[PDB]
Paper text:
The Tet(X) flavin-dependent monooxygenases enable tetracycline antibiotic resistance by catalysing inactivating hydroxylation, so preventing inhibition of bacterial ribosomes. Tetracycline destructases (TDases) are an emerging family of flavin-dependent monooxygenase (FMO) enzymes providing resistance to tetracyclines by catalysing C11a hydroxylation. C11a hydroxylation is proposed to hinder chelation of the tetracycline core to Mg2+ ions, thereby blocking binding to ribosomes and abolishing antibiotic activity.
Prochlorperazine displayed improved activity compared to trifluoperazine, differing by replacement of the 2-trifluoromethyl-substituent with a chlorine, with an IC50app of 39.9 ± 7.0 and IC50 49.5 ± 24.9 μM in the FP- and UPLC-based assays, respectively. Clear electron density in the active site of Tet(X4) is observed for the tricyclic phenothiazine group in both the trifluoperazine and prochlorperazine complexes, including their 2-trifluoromethyl- and 2-chloro-substituents, respectively. In the prochlorperazine complex and equivalent conformation with trifluoperazine, the protonated quaternary amine of the 4-methyl-piperazine group is proximal to Asp61 and Glu114 near the active site entrance, allowing for formation of a charge–charge interaction. Perazines, with a 3-(4-methylpiperazin-1-yl)propyl group attached to their 10-phenothiazinyl amine, bound with greater affinity than their promazine counterparts, which possess a N,N-dimethylpropan-1-amine group at the same position. The three compounds bind to the active site in a manner overlapping with the tigecycline binding site, validating their proposed mechanism of action as non-covalent competitive inhibitors.
Author numbering: 12 to 382
The structure:
C-alpha cells in the first residue's frame, strides 16, 4: 500500500477533515486529526448544512453514515417573501424529494463523524502554526504543545488557513459583500411574527441590495443572516463594532427602515451579532508542483467561495471522497500521484462551483434583484 507503515495528519476537524479521517481510517490507515478547538463540546456557530446526492451524501454512504445523517437531518421547504412580509413563493418538500438535501445542525454532523472515528483520532487543542519537511516526514509545530510528525499532511483547516504555502502562494480575497449573522433562542416567543412568517420553512427575502436568509428551526433556535455590499465607509470596517449590539442594531434598523416590523423585531431582539466579510480562495493556475514532501488541501482550505447559492461543504466532501479513494485503491505508484489526480479533478468541479457562486453573488446583490 501507499500508506502502509506511514501515518497521515489531517489539519482541522471540520466536517471535511473529519470525513477525510473516517474514509482513511476505515481502510486501515494510521490517521490523526489536529483540531484547534479546546474540546468536542465547543459550540459551532452558523446555519445548517445540507448534503447533496452524488457528493456530500456519497461521502457519507462510503463511510456507512448515510442513514445516521438522514436520522438527524430535516427536509425543509423554502418561502420567498418581500420586504413587506408578503409571501411571494412557498415550496414545501415533496415526500419523494425528502432525501435530496435535508438540513442538519453542524454540531450534530460533527458528532456523527466523531462517533464514527476510533477513540483519540482527533487531538483537541492543537492549533498548527508551522510545517517543516524532513528527509521523509513532516514536522508539525503546534501552539504551546509538543510537535508531531507525519508522512502525509492534509490541510483541512478552513478558508482562512495560514499553512498553505507549501501548496500554493494564492491568497484569500474579499469579494465585496458582507454578512451579519445571529441566533434567536425560542423564536416562537422572542420573534413570533417573523417565526410565523417562516411557518416551518426556510425564508429568503431581498430588497434594495439587502438580503435576508433565515432558518426558523436549527435544533430549536432560529438562525438568520443579513447580507449586503460592503459599505464604502468600511475601508476600515468603521462605525459597526460587532461587540456592541446597540451599534449593530442601529446600523441594521437604518438599512431595513422600509421593511415590515416583523423583520425589524428580529433585529431588535437579537442578543449578539457576528459580522463576516465574504471571501474566496480563487482556483486559477495550478498549485505548486514538486513539493518537498506529500501535502495537499481539501474543503474550504482548497476552494473557499461565497455561500449564497448553496456551494460550500459538498465540494469539500467530494474532495475527501476522491482523495481517500486515490490513497487507498492501489492504482497509484506514489502518494504524490494520488494527490495530483485528486487536485486535477478538484480544479474542474471546484472552478465550476466558484464561477457559479461568484456569478450568483454578482446577480443577487444588484440593487433591483428579486428571487
Ligand atoms: C454564512 C455562511 C453560510 C454557509 C456557508 C458558509 C458561510 C460563511 N457554507 C460553507 C460551508 O459551511 C463550508 O464549506 C464548510 O464549513 C467547509 O468545511 P471545512 O471542514 O473545509 O472547513 P471549516 O471551516 O468548517 O473547518 C475548519 C476546521 O479547522 C479548525 N482549524 C482552523 N485553524 C486550525 C489550525 N491552525 N490548526 C488546527 N485546526 C484548525 C477549525 O477550528 C475548524 O474545525 C455553506 N455550505 C453548504 O454546503 N451549505 C450552506 O448552506 C452553507 N451556508
Ligand atoms: C439548501 N441550502 C440552504 C442555504 N443555502 C444558502 C446559504 C445562505 N445562508 C447565508 C448567506 C449569507 C449570510 C448568512 C447566511 S446564514 C443563512 C441562514 C439561513 C439560511 Cl436558509 C441560509 C443562509 C443554499 C442551499
Amino acid at each position: 500500500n501507499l500508506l502502509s507503515d506511514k501515518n497521515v495528519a489531517i489539519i482541522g476537524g471540520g466536517p471535511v477533515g473529519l470525513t477525510m479521517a473516517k474514509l482513511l481510517q476505515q481502510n486501515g490507515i494510521d490517521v490523526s486529526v489536529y483540531e484547534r478547538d479546546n474540546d468536542r463540546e465547543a459550540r459551532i456557530f452558523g446555519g445548517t448544512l445540507d448534503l447533496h446526492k452524488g457528493s456530500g451524501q456519497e461521502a457519507m454512504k462510503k463511510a456507512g453514515l448515510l442513514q445516521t445523517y438522514y436520522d438527524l437531518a430535516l427536509p425543509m421547504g423554502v418561502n420567498i417573501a418581500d420586504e413587506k412580509g408578503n409571501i411571494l413563493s412557498t415550496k414545501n418538500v415533496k415526500p419523494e424529494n425528502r432525501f435530496d438535501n435535508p438540513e442538519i445542525n453542524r454540531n450534530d454532523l460533527r458528532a456523527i463523524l466523531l462517533n464514527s472515528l476510533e477513540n483519540d483520532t482527533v487531538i483537541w487543542d492543537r492549533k498548527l502554526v508551522m510545517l517543516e519537511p524532513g528527509k521523509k516526514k513532516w514536522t508539525l509545530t503546534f501552539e504551546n504543545k509538543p510537535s508531531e510528525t507525519a508522512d502525509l499532511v492534509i490541510i483541512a483547516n478552513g478558508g482562512m488557513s495560514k499553512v498553505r504555502k507549501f501548496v500554493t502562494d494564492t491568497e484569500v480575497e474579499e469579494t465585496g459583500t458582507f454578512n451579519i449573522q445571529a441566533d434567536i433562542h425560542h423564536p416562537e416567543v422572542n420573534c413570533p411574527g417573523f417565526f410565523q412568517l417562516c411557518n416551518g420553512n426556510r425564508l429568503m427575502a431581498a430588497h434594495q441590495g439587502n438580503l435576508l436568509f433565515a432558518n426558523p428551526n436549527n435544533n430549536g433556535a432560529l438562525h438568520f443572516g443579513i447580507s449586503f455590499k460592503t459599505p464604502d465607509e468600511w475601508k476600515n470596517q468603521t462605525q459597526v463594532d460587532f461587540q456592541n449590539r446597540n451599534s449593530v442594531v442601529d446600523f441594521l434598523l437604518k438599512e431595513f427602515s422600509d421593511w415590515d416590523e416583523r423583520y425589524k423585531e428580529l433585529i431588535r431582539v437579537t442578543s449578539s451579532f457576528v459580522g463576516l466579510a465574504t471571501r474566496i480562495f480563487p482556483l486559477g493556475k495550478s498549485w505548486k508542483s514538486k513539493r518537498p514532501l506529500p501535502i495537499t488541501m481539501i474543503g474550504d482550505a482548497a476552494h473557499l467561495m461565497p455561500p449564497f447559492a448553496g456551494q460550500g461543504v459538498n465540494s469539500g466532501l467530494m474532495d475527501a471522497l476522491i482523495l481517500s479513494d486515490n490513497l487507498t485503491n492501489g492504482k497509484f505508484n506514489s502518494i504524490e500521484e494520488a494527490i495530483e489526480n485528486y487536485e486535477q479533478q478538484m480544479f474542474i468541479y471546484g472552478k465550476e462551483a466558484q464561477e457559479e457562486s461568484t456569478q450568483n453573488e454578482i446577480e443577487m446583490f444588484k440593487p433591483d434583484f428579486t428571487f
